[PDB]
Design a protein around this ligand. Structure first.
Ligand SMILES: [Mg+2]
Ligand SMILES: [Mg+2]
Ligand SMILES: [Mg+2]
Ligand SMILES: [Mg+2]
Ligand SMILES: [Mg+2]
Ligand SMILES: [Mg+2]
Ligand SMILES: [Mg+2]
Ligand SMILES: [Mg+2]
Ligand SMILES: [Mg+2]
Ligand SMILES: [Mg+2]
Ligand SMILES: [Mg+2]
Ligand SMILES: [Mg+2]
Ligand SMILES: [Mg+2]
Ligand SMILES: [Mg+2]
Ligand code: NA
Lengths: 77, 149, 100, 271
RNA sequence: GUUUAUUAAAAACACAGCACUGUGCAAACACGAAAGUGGACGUAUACGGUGUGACGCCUGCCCGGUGCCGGGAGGUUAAU
């Protein structure tokens, strides 16, 4: 799925309001990217499907902290 | 990123600077190597207090055996014998991997990415001047001769 | 086995390779009992017009008596060789070893 | 040769055949064949994705050595053979180590010819070698677009690519479409034009010829109803519309290349 | 040869042939939220789309309108 691994951003739905207010169901999709993060504590690259906000969260916290959340929740990589 | 540096970076570091780099730069080049770390609070404590001076001596041990050029005049002229044709113009190149595995002593002693070339790879059976960089500050001018096989 | 006459210029940086060129070709000619008569390596001459952004080629004249398949393989070597510039084979039907 | 059939019946009157008397009149080489089941044009989902395909004759897939990555070892062209998958004929060759392989047959390739591949090979037609050892201006075929890839340009019958320029790591190639493409000079290319250069002279005579080649009939868009095709409708041969594909996109001139990642290679495009 | 199974078998559809056009390969194009698949285990003498419809003699003038292609100077022009 187009689900981020850190933030958990799955796709959501909304309307595509036109200038005449015609609502047609559309999807907002996360800015997902498969990025390869270096783990110095493991000395290896771990690939994740993270959004850009997921990347910013990993960069604010540590990659070890985010991987800890993944592992505690039940994620794989 | 506010990143504290652990090495003299060519244009933006002084081995202890807390400089503001671009997040993608710090993410894909520095932190994946040992060149920098995030300078928020805890790594600032660790570097600037604990081992700001111990890492200096570790980097000096690393700069040793590197400042050991000792192979730009190893003996001299590591000469490679490849299957070349007449009129020079050796068909296939003698790669940097072949250069390294012929120049160290007998191959498995060094890596591949120390070899620099102002000519590309190889186009002639003759005399060529290859450079090395075992450290970022290394004036290595190894000399290579080509032999037909 | 007819009498040819071959004037070929070569790049003025493989001028160091003109010996090996000459002995290689004359050996190939002698292998089929072809007889070399003149072997005047003219040295580095200055061209009258620039051939491939390059003046001052290196000339070699050689008068041989060899069969057609020999001379044709020789022409192919001249073609597929990158240093040989403006080869010219010619018939002469005689033995000309005088000068020039 | 190009043989025109005698008009002893309609559907035989207009035929023109290409009889290649050098093709093997027997079963092909067995270990280099594998089954090739027809598709009908239908994709993974069972739906017709490309139309006008179906039926035709059974045909086994001949494993052709497109890569030609057996360097140094010479080979003798044992046999010329008809390939039902290509427009060109294939050539079973035997290497001096005892291995038989199908190759594409260049123009000057008869039985017993001595070919090879590798960086030191000669420049005889049929000899594969990377497009650095090949002189510029020469006529090559079975060109690779990536080193070790396998060869994808000029492998139809009578087709060839020409080496126009050579700039360091890359080579410019005039392709069979007039487009000049840059491919890296480590890519291999077999020398000479591809054989069966008169293949384009057959004229198939009748409808069943295309039918057993595997080409189902093509209904003109106008011969349909407005629900079926953008063209259609009209009380008797009415068009009044701009010509388009059955899915609305303009045809009869509308550039539909959008790659933007291989444009760095196309020096100049088709005429 | 095909067609309105069940009031229309035709001059309609198809056809070989012709032409224009797209497509340089991870091809265009199609099915698919995507992966992927067909094209094609093919490679411009190939493939898709379109019109015409063996063959013979030919296919004349018009680019003003609509379309497509190329240009990019200048006018106008979104988010920011
Ligand atoms: Mg079709
Ligand atoms: Mg048709
Ligand atoms: Mg039709
Ligand atoms: Mg109708
Ligand atoms: Mg419609
Ligand atoms: Mg009616
Ligand atoms: Mg009418
Ligand atoms: Mg009826
Ligand atoms: Mg019926
Ligand atoms: Mg009836
Ligand atoms: Mg019609
Ligand atoms: Mg007209
Ligand atoms: Mg106009
Ligand atoms: Mg326009
Ligand atoms: Na117009």
């Amino acid at each position: 799925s187009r689900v981020c691994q850190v933030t958990g951003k799955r796709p959501v739905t909304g309307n595509n309001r036109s200038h005449a207010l015609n609502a047609t169901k559309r999807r907002f999709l996360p800015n997902l990217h498969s990025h390869r993060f270096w783990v110095e504590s493991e000395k290896r690259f771990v690939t994740l499907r993270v959004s850009a906000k997921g990347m910013r969260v990993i960069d604010k916290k540590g990659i070890d902290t985010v991987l800890a959340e993944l592992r505690a929740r039940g994620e794989k990589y | 990123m506010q990143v504290i540096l652990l090495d003299k970076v060519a244009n933006l570091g002084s081995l202890g600077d807390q400089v503001n780099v671009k997040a993608g730069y710090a993410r894909n080049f520095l932190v994946p190597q040992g060149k920098a770390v995030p300078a928020t609070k805890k790594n600032i404590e660790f570097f600037e207090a604990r081992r700001a001076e111990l890492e200096a001596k570790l980097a000096e041990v690393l700069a040793a055996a590197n400042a050991r050029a000792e192979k730009i005049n190893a003996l001299e002229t590591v000469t490679i014998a490849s299957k070349a044709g007449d009129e020079g113009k050796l068909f296939g190149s003698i790669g940097t991997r072949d250069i390294a595995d012929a120049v160290t002593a007998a191959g498995v002693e060094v890596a591949k990415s120390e070899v620099r070339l102002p000519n590309g790879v190889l186009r002639t059976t003759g005399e060529h001047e290859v450079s090395f960089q075992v450290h970022s500050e290394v004036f290595a001018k190894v000399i290579v001769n080509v032999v037909a096989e | 086995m007819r009498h040819y006459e071959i004037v070929f210029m070569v790049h003025p940086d493989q001028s160091e390779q003109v010996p090996g060129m000459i002995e290689r070709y004359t050996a190939a000619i002698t292998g089929a009992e072809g007889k070399i008569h003149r072997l005047e390596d003219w040295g580095r001459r200055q061209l009258a017009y620039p051939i491939n952004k390059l003046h001052k080629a290196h000339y070699v004249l050689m008068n041989v008596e060899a069969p057609q398949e020999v001379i044709d393989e020789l022409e192919t070597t001249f073609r597929f060789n990158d240093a040989v510039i403006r080869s010219m084979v010619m018939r002469t039907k005689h033995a000309v070893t005088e000068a020039s | 040769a190009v043989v025109k059939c005698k008009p002893t019946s309609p559907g035989r009157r207009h035929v023109v055949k290409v009889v290649n008397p050098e093709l093997h009149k027997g079963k092909p080489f067995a270990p280099l064949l594998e089954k090739n089941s027809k598709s009908g044009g239908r994709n993974n989902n069972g739906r017709i994705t490309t139309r006008h395909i179906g039926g035709g004759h059974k045909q086994a897939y001949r494993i052709v050595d497109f890569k030609r990555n057996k360097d140094g070892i010479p080979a003798v062209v044992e046999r010329l053979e008809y390939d039902p998958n290509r427009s060109a004929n294939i050539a079973l060759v035997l290497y001096k180590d005892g291995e038989r392989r199908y190759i594409l047959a260049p123009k000057g390739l008869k039985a017993g010819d001595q070919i090879q591949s590798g960086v030191d090979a000669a420049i005889k037609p049929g000899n594969t070698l990377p497009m650095r050892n090949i002189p510029v201006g020469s006529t090559v075929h079975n060109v690779e677009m990536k080193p070790g890839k396998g060869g994808q340009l000029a492998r139809s019958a009578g087709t060839y690519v020409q080496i126009v320029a050579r700039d360091g790591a890359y080579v410019t190639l005039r392709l069979r479409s007039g487009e000049m493409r840059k491919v890296e000079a480590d890519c291999r290319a077999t020398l000479g034009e591809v054989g069966n250069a008169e293949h384009m002279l057959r004229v198939l005579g009748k409808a069943g010829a295309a039918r057993w080649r595997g080409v189902r009939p093509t209904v003109r868009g106008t011969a349909m109803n407005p629900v079926d095709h953008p063209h259609g409708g009209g009380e008797g041969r009415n068009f009044g519309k701009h010509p388009v594909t059955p899915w609305g996109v303009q045809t009869k001139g509308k550039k539909t290349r959008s790659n933007k990642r291989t444009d760095k290679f196309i020096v100049r495009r088709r005429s």
